[PDB]
Amino acid sequence: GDTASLLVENGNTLWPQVVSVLQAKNYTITQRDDAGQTLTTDWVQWNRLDEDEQYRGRYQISVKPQGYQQAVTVKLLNLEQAGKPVADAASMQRYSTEMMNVISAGLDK
Amino acid sequence: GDTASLLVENGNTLWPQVVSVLQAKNYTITQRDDAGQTLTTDWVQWNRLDEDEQYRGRYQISVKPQGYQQAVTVKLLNLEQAGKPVADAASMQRYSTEMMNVISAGLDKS
């Protein structure tokens, strides 16, 4: 799998918070449209012991209300393993979750 | 906080796999209904170096079809910090994510 989503119960501006987490991780943001609270990242590397199985992904990240609350969404656009494209369901769901995990950890601090 | 969801692009039986990951973690499953693909966990403690700040949560976990794919959902039912109930947004979302991450990692390798 391919989209992860998370409900955030803040009572507002979750979008600038998510953007700030990504800036703080120094991810390159290749497309960003604040009016639609959506962005696309350049490749993010998932550093791991085994380079011959290091993964990298690109994502579309957004915030949408799901009234009364807001939801953060992470959509895995492309995935590579040691620089070769991959599309296996196990890796796709893991690497969607790994970007969600970055955003969630960032939002707690 | 509250609910986390993840699309898994398999196809089928994602539900028995999710169950197997939790059994592997030795989590206690207090309620389970396979026909409805849902279960409730006992408290799950999230280990931290500072024990007076340690959280535990209880979760409703389920799988449902979403279009042609399957969605895993984690709902954080209750959260406590060093035994005290807590409801702050920032904690709730992180400890919803912590359980999703356990399930995800389990579905990846095994």
UniProtKB/Swiss-Prot annotation, chain B:
Function in brief: Part of the outer membrane protein assembly complex (Bam), which is involved in assembly and insertion of beta-barrel proteins into the outer membrane. Nonessential member of the complex that stabilizes the interaction between the essential proteins BamA and BamD. Efficient substrate folding and insertion into the outer membrane requires all 5 subunits.
Coiled-coil parts of chain: none
Quaternary state and interactors: Part of the Bam complex, which is composed of the outer membrane protein BamA, and four lipoproteins BamB, BamC, BamD and BamE. Forms a subcomplex with BamD and BamE. The Bam complex has the shape of a hat, with the BamA beta-barrel crown in the outer membrane and the periplasmic brim formed by the BamA POTRA domains and the 4 lipoproteins.
Name of encoding gene: bamC
Originating species: Escherichia coli (strain K12)
Protein name: Outer membrane protein assembly factor BamC
Domain commentary: Contains two well-defined domains connected by a flexible linker. The C-terminal domain may serve as an important protein-binding surface for interaction with other Bam components or substrates. In addition, contains a long unstructured N-terminal region, which is required to stabilize the BamCD complex. Only the N-terminus of this protein is observed in the Bam complex in X-ray or EM structures, most of the protein must be highly mobile.
Localization terms from the record: Cell outer membrane
Family designation: Belongs to the BamC family.
